[PDB]
Design a protein around this ligand. Structure first.
Ligand SMILES: Nc1ncnc2c1ncn2[C@@H]1O[C@H](COP(=O)(O)OP(=O)(O)OP(=O)(O)O)[C@@H](O)[C@H]1O
Ligand SMILES: Nc1ncnc2c1ncn2[C@@H]1O[C@H](COP(=O)(O)OP(=O)(O)OP(=O)(O)O)[C@@H](O)[C@H]1O
Ligand SMILES: Nc1ncnc2c1ncn2[C@@H]1O[C@H](COP(=O)(O)OP(=O)(O)OP(=O)(O)O)[C@@H](O)[C@H]1O
Ligand SMILES: Nc1ncnc2c1ncn2[C@@H]1O[C@H](COP(=O)(O)OP(=O)(O)OP(=O)(O)O)[C@@H](O)[C@H]1O
Lengths: 525, 525, 525, 115
C-alpha cells in the first residue's frame, strides 16, 4: 500500500547499517581460519557454516532500509557467485570496505558521481593489472594442484579432474556422477551441453545441489511456444504410461504452461523438467536438429507443420542421463546413433567451410566442438555413501574452481593478489580531487580481504598487511600455518576470474550503491 | 520473514545461558543418585525421569538464541546417543564444562581457533589414552557382568545375553522378543541384518521403542526408485486383500511416494514400512538377491525388465517377523529355503575365493557372515505383562551396552575413566599459550562427570575428585554405597566406546561452538 | 560536583551545534545590509542591534557542551575584538566556516593534527599575502577617508581624526571628550598613556563605554604591593575629605585590597580606580618618576623607605582628567610643571645617548616620545546631548579603525580582501593529503564573509563570489548600493590589522577546536 | 633514557623470557609485558598512525631506535633529543603497577548511598 521514502544521509546510514550487518555476518566466515556462523533451521538443529553463501542467503533485516541494503549486497554476492562459484565472502568484504569508505567520503561532501567514477577507473586499472599479473594454469600439473587445493587438499579429486580435463580438452565438458566401486570411474561418452536453465525453481529435485538430475529420461524437442497444456496432454499421458522422467526443450514456455507444470510436479505423477530453447533462430533450429540426432528425437515447429499434440513415444528423444543446472543443461549418453552424429558433424563442418560471416562461423565451430568432443564423467569412488556425497560436493566446487582458473588464470590466493594489485597502482591519479579520493578508496579497500583473513586468524591486520606490502612478488602470509612465505610454494591459489569478478561486482554495486539517495519502501506495518 | 543477527560476546553469552539451562536440566539426573526431573505431559500426570534423553529431548527455550544453544547441545547429545545408546547426560556434562571454560577463556581474549585446536589435540590424546586404558570384554564372564550391571543388576538378563553372544559369536545379531512362558526362551533362526532405517517417523508403530515390529509380513524387494504410487497400487491392493503387514525394500523412495505412504498409514488400511536399499551397486544387487533367497522373494529392477506394477503375492518375500529400527533393520525367520540359502553361501564363498580386490572381499565376507550366522532371539520370560515390558527394556539397553563394550572395550565406570585419562595427560603442551590453555580446558573439564555424580550424591565434589586423583588404577568413589573402592570390584563399568564417543562429540560441538560469532535468527514475533 | 565527559564524534557534533547556533546568531548582523538581532533586557524593551559584539556576548546555550562550543567561539571573537575593536562578526563567520569544513573533514577520518597543520600553513600564507596586498594609509587623505567611512560616512569626524593624527604624529595619543559648543574643540595637552587596565570590572563608572573617566582626580603613585588596606586608610580619609575621584598606581594590588576597594565603590563614598604599575623594574620606576613629574606626585617604594600610610594631599599627583580603559590608561592635563617635564625629557634623552642595550634604548625612546608628544583631545561639538553621545561613539570606533589602519595598512573591505587572498593562494600544497585538505578548508572558508554579506543582502552568494573571483584587483560587490565596482572608488575599506587578526584568531581557535575530543562538564542538574 | 615510549618497549623486549611460579603469575607477567607497550601505542594513536605497525617496527629495531612523533619519522631519539628521565618513567610504571596490584584485588566497594 502506501509508502515511506527516506532520502539524504539518513537513507545512506540506514543502508550502511544494513550492509555492515550482512557483511560482518558473512565475513566472520572468511578465510581458512574463518569462524563458524550458526543459522536457524525451523526444525531440528541450527545449521552451522563457514560458507558465506549460506550465511548471506539467510540474511534479511527487520528494518526495511537495512533490509534494502542487505538485499543489495546479498544480490551482488549471489551475482559474483553465479559468475564464478566461490568467493562470495571476498566479494562482500570488498563491497563493504568500498561502500563504507565511499559513504564516509560522500558525507565529507565529495561528489558521489565523481567518487563513483574514481572507483570505476581504479577498478578498471585493477582488472587490467590483475590480467597482467595473472599466471596461466594451462599446464596439467597446476590444474591438478588447484583441483587438490580447492577440494580440501585431496590429490585424488584434482588428479581425476586433470585426466578428464585432458580427455575433453581445454574448454570441454566435465560432469560428476556417483560411482558404485571404490575406484573412481572416469569415462567419456558423447553428449550435449548448452546454456539454458529451468523455468521454475520447483522443477529441481535436489535443492541442496540446484540441478535436476534425471536417469534415463525421455526428451522432447520443440521449436515453438507452449501456449496451452493441451499440447502437453498426450505427452504427459505417454510419459505417465512410461513412468520415466521427462525433459522438455521448447522455444518459449508461457507462464500458465509453467504454472500447470509446477502444479503437476507438486502432484508429481509426472517428472517434468523444462528448459528454454538454446541458441537463436536458424542456429537454434540447427543445433536442435543436432540434439535430435544425439537423442534420436524430432524437433516440432509451427512453421514446418507438426504439432506438440501429434507426439508419440518414438518421436521423443532419449538419453541415459541428463542434468539441468541453474543456467545450464547437459545430456549424457544419448540414444541416437553415433554414425548419424558423425554425419551431422561432417555437415556442420562443410557449413564451416562455406561460412563467410565470422560470428556464424564461430557458432558452427562451437557446434562441431560440442558435437564431437562429448562429455567426460567422473564417478566418485570410495566406500561410503556419506563420503560419496561429501566427495561429490568436493568434486563439484573443485571443478568449478578448475574451470574458472582455466578460463582466465591463477593468482596467489590469500588476498595477496589484491594487495599486490594495490601496490602496483598507488600512482594512479584522477581528473579532480574527488575521483582521486575514489581511487584511494579503492586502494584502501582492496586490502580488506587480507586484513579480514588475518583478523579471523587473530593476528594484527595492519602489521600483516604492511608485511605483505613490503614483500614483492607472491610473498604473503599463510593463514592455515599462520606463517609467512610464498603462496605458490604452499599452494594457496585463487582463480583470476573469481577474484576479478568479485572485485568487479563489488565495485559495480558500490558505484550504484554510493549514488543512492531516495529509498522508497513498503510502509512498516 | 525478517531476521535479527547477534554477534560478539552477547551471542556467546546467550548461547552459554542456553547450554547452561539444558545441561543443568539433564545433569540433575546424572549418576545412580541422579535426582528426578519432572517433565510435562499435555494430558494426565507429568512424567518423571532420571534419563537425560527424555529431559534433553523435551527442552526448547523461549529466547531464540538460548534456544539455539539448547538445540546444539541437545543435537550433539542425540548424536552421541545414536552412536552408543547411553551416556547422554555424560556427553552433555562434558560439553557444558568444555564450552563454559572455553567461552570464559575466549572472553579473556584468547584465540578461538587456537583454543579449539588445543581442545582438539587434548581430546585426541584423551581418545588414544582411553584406548590404551581400555580393558577388553572379550571374555564371557565380563560380558555377563556388564549385561547384569546395565540391566539394573539383573544376572538373568546378562546371562541370556552371554549365551546369545556365544551362539552368534563376537559380531553376531541378537534381538529381543516377548516369550509366552515364564522361562526365558533362547533360539537361533537364520535371518537378515542390515543398516537401513525407515523413510519417515510416521512408519513407526511403537514410538516408545522407535522401531517397526511386524509379525508375519510380506516383503517386497526392489532395486529401483519409487517415483509414483501407481507402481505400489497393485501391491497395496494385494496386501489389503491379504490383511498383513508390508515391508518395502527399494533403491529410492521419492518424497511423494513417501507422502502417499504416510497418508496411507494415517489411513492405516495398509501396514507399510519402507526402507532404503542396503549396500551399493553390484554389492547391493547381490545382497538383495541374498535377501530374496532368505525370504523367497524377487528383486525388481528397471534394467532387467520387470516392474513394480507386475507384482504378485507369490513374488513378494515373506518372513515370520521383521524389526525396523531408527537406522537398522533385521528380519527373523524368513520363509525361503535353507538349502537355497546354503547354495547362496557357497556362491558368495567362491566369490570370496575369486576376489582379488580387498574391499569387495570383506564385503563378500560380511555377506557370508550375515547369511550363515543368522540371528539369535532372546524371548523374555516372566509372569506379568508389565514386568515383561520392563524386563524387555532392560534387555534392550543391556544388550546395547554389551555390544558397545564388545566393539571397543570396557573401562571402570563412575567418571574415573576420564579422571585417570586426565591424570595421564597433565604433561601435554600445545604450540602456543592459547592451545595450552585449551588443553587445560579439556583437562579441567573431563573431571566434570565425576564431580557431577558426587554433587548428585551430595558429597563434596572437589574432595572426592582429589581423592580419586590421588589413587592410581581403577580406584574411585562408588556412588550407590557412597564408599570408595575399586570399580571392578563393585562392578561399576562403562564401555570404552560410549565414553569415548561422548567425549569426542562433546569436544566436537565445543570446538564448533566456541568459534560461533554470528547468530542469525527468526525475528521474535 | 560530579561530571559527565563526552569524547568522540558526539563531542564534535555537540560543539558544532553550539558554534553553529552562536555563529548564525551573530552572522545575521554581518554587513551593512546586516539584519537586526533583538536581545532581551530583563526590564523594558528588548534591545536591537546590528553589532555582533552585543549578540555574541549575550549567547550561552542550555546544553552544557553546546555552551562549551559557544563560549569558545565567543571568547575568540572577544579576543579578536580586543586586538582590533571591530570585525567580530567577520571573525565568527570565519571561525564557523573553518570549523564546519574542518570537522566535516575529520568525520572523513583525516588526521586532526595534520588538518590543523594545513589550516596553520594556509593561514600563515594568507597573513603574508595580506601583508603583501596591504595598502598603507600613511597619507592623511586616506586617514580622513577611513575615519569618514568608519563613522557612518561622516566627513567631520574623519577630518578631526586626521588633524589630531597630524598633531600627535603617526603613533600619538588621541582621545575623545565632550565639548559644549557646536564647534569641535581640538587641542593638545601634555599627558600620559600607558598599557595597564583596571583591577576589577566594578571600578568602571560607565559600563556602556568600558572605561573609567574621572574629572580632576588625585593620583597616587606607588612602587609597592598593596598588601593591606590600612596603607590606603589615610589616603581614603584624605580623598573623602577632598571629595574628588581617586586614581591609584601601584606595583601589585592584592585580592583583598581589591576586595575592600570593590566594597568601598559599592559603598561609593570614595571614587577609587586602581591600575597596575606600567613598565618593569628600573624602567617602571623611572617612568613612574616621569608620571610623578607630569602630575606633581611622588612615587612610594618599600626599598627607598616611605610608606603608603605616610601620604599627604600634597604628595599625591593631580590632573584635570584621566581615562582608565580595559587595558589602557591615559592622563590629560597633569598639574605638574612643563619645565620639570622638559627637564625629565632631557634627562631621558641623555639616557638614550648613553644607552647601549637596544631594547633599553627603545624603552627610553618611547619614554621621551610619550613625555614630549603629549595627548590630543578632540572635544565633540553638536547641538543635542543625544547627538553628543552618538557622535562620541562614532568618534571612538572611527579612531579605533583609524589607528588599526595606521598600524598595518588598509585593504578593500567587503570581504574581497580574503577573496583576493584566496585567489592568490590556490596553488599552495601541503606535506600530505590531509594538510592539503586543510589548506583547501581554509581556502573555501576565507570566502565565507563575502558570501555572508551577500546572503544578508539577499542576492545569490555563489554567483557574487564567482563574479568577485573572476575580477582581479580590488573589484568587488558593494552591498549598500548592491552594485559591483571598485571598493576604493566607493570608499569601502577595512584595516589590514582587523581582518588579519580576525582570520588569525579564527584559524587559531579552529586548530584548537578541531583537535578537541574529550569535554568534561558540570553535570546537568 | 630515550623518550617516546621506546624505554618501556625496550624493557619489555629485554624481559620476554621471564617466567613465574605458576600459570597465573606467568599470565600477570605477560599482562605487564603487553601493557608497558601501551604508551608508545597511545602516542602513535594520537599521531593517527597504526599503533601495532609502529610497535612492531620499534620492537624489531634494537637499542634506542624508535618512532619520532613530532616529525612522524623513525630514527634514534638520542640523535633528535627526545629523552625522558629514568626516574619519572620508573616511578610512573611503579605507581601504575602498584595501584593495579591493589586495584585488581578489590572486591567490596562500599559507597555513600546515591541520593
Ligand atoms: N591457507 C590459506 N592461507 C591464506 N589464505 C587462504 C588460505 N586458504 C584459503 N585462503 C583464502 O581465504 C579465502 C577462502 O575463504 P572461504 O573458503 O571461506 O570462502 P570464499 O572462497 O572466500 O567464499 P565463499 O565460500 O563464501 O564463496 C580466499 O580468499 C582464499 O584465497
Ligand atoms: N554405582 C555407581 N557409582 C558410581 N558411578 C556410577 C554408578 N552407577 C552408574 N554410575 C555412573 O553414572 C552414569 C550413569 O548415569 P545414568 O544411568 O543416569 O545415565 P547415563 O548413562 O550417563 O546417560 P543417559 O542420559 O544416556 O541415560 C555413568 O557415568 C556411570 O559410570
Ligand atoms: N557598503 C558595503 N559593501 C560591502 N561590504 C561592506 C560595506 N560596508 C561594510 N562592509 C563590510 O561588512 C563588514 C562590516 O559589518 P559590521 O559593521 O556589521 O561588522 P564588523 O565590522 O565585521 O564587526 P562587528 O561585529 O565587531 O561590528 C565588514 O566586513 C565590511 O568590510
Ligand atoms: N617528539 C616526540 N616523539 C615521540 N614521543 C615524544 C616526543 N616528545 C615527547 N614524547 C613523549 O610523549 C610524552 C610526553 O607527553 P606530554 O608532554 O603530553 O605529557 P607527560 O609528560 O606524559 O605527562 P604530564 O604532562 O601529564 O605529566 C612522553 O612519554 C615523551 O617521551
Amino acid at each position: 500500500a502506501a509508502k515511506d521514502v527516506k532520502f539524504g544521509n539518513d537513507a545512506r546510514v540506514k543502508m550502511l547499517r544494513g550492509v555492515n550487518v550482512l557483511a560482518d555476518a558473512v565475513k566472520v566466515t572468511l578465510g581458512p581460519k574463518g569462524r563458524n556462523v550458526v543459522l536457524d533451521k525451523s526444525f531440528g538443529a541450527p545449521t552451522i557454516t563457514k560458507d558465506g553463501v549460506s550465511v548471506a542467503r539467510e540474511i534479511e533485516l527487520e528494518d526495511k532500509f537495512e533490509n534494502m541494503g542487505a538485499q543489495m549486497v546479498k544480490e551482488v554476492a549471489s551475482k559474483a557467485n553465479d559468475a564464478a562459484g566461490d568467493g562470495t565472502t571476498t566479494a562482500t568484504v570488498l563491497a563493504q570496505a568500498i561502500i563504507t569508505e565511499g559513504l564516509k567520503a560522500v558525507a565529507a561532501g565529495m561528489n558521489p558521481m565523481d567518487l563513483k567514477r574514481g572507483i570505476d577507473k581504479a577498478v578498471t586499472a585493477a582488472v587490467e593489472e590483475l590480467k597482467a599479473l595473472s599466471v596461466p594454469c594451462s599446464d596439467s600439473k597446476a590444474i591438478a594442484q588447484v583441483g587438490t587445493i580447492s577440494a580440501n587438499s585431496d590429490e585424488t579429486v584434482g588428479k581425476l579432474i586433470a585426466e578428464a580435463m585432458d580427455k575433453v580438452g581445454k574448454e570441454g565438458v566435465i560432469t560428476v556422477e556417483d560411482g558404485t566401486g571404490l575406484q573412481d570411474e572416469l569415462d567419456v561418452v558423447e553428449g550435449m551441453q548448452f546454456d539454458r536453465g529451468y523455468l521454475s525453481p520447483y522443477f529441481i529435485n535436489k535443492p541442496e545441489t540446484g540441478a535436476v538430475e534425471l536417469e534415463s529420461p525421455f526428451i522432447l524437442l520443440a521449436d515453438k511456444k507452449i501456449s496451452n497444456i493441451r499440447e502437453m496432454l498426450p505427452v504427459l499421458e505417454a510419459v505417465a504410461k512410461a513412468g520415466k522422467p521427462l525433459l522438455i526443450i521448447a522455444e518459449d514456455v508461457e507462464g500458465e504452461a509453467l504454472a500447470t507444470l509446477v502444479v503437476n510436479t507438486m502432484r508429481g505423477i509426472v517428472k517434468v523438467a523444462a528448459v528454454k530453447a538454446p541458441g537463436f533462430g536458424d542456429r537454434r533450429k540447427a543445433m536442435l536438429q543436432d540434439i535430435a540426432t544425439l537423442t534420436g528425437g524430432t524437433v516440432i515447429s509451427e512453421e514446418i507443420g507438426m504439432e506438440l499434440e501429434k507426439a508419440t513415444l518414438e518421436d521423443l528423444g532419449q538419453a541415459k542421463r541428463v542434468v539441468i543446472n541453474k543456467d545450464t543443461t547437459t545430456i549424457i549418453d544419448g540414444v541416437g546413433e553415433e554414425a548419424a552424429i558423425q554425419g551431422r558433424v561432417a555437415q556442420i563442418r562443410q557449413q564451416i567451410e562455406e561460412a563467410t560471416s565470422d560470428y556464424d562461423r564461430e557458432k558452427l565451430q562451437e557446434r562441431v566442438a560440442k558435437l564431437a568432443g562429448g562429455v567426460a564423467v567422473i564417478k566418485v569412488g570410495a566406500a561410503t555413501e556419506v563420503e560419496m556425497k561429501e566427495k561429490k560436493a568436493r568434486v563439484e566446487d573443485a571443478l568449478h574452481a578448475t574451470r574458472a582458473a582455466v578460463e582466465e588464470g591463477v593468482v596467489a590466493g590469500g588476498g595477496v593478489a589484491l594487495i599486490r594489485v594495490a601496490s602496483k597502482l598507488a600512482d594512479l591519479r584522477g581528473q579532480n580531487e574527488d575521483q582521486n579520493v575514489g581511487i584511494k578508496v579503492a586502494l584502501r579497500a582492496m586490502e580488506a580481504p587480507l586484513r579480514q583473513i588475518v583478523l579471523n586468524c587473530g593476528e594484527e591486520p595492519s602489521v600483516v598487511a604492511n608485511t605483505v606490502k613490503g614483500g614483492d612478488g607472491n610473498y604473503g602470509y599463510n593463514a592455515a600455518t599462520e606463517e609467512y612465505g610464498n603462496m605458490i610454494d604452499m599452494g594457496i591459489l585463487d582463480p583470476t576470474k573469481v577474484t576479478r569478478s568479485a572485485l568487479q561486482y563489488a565495485a559495480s554495486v558500490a558505484g550504484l550503491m554510493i549514488t543512492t539517495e531516495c529509498m522508497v519502501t513498503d510502509l512498516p506495518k
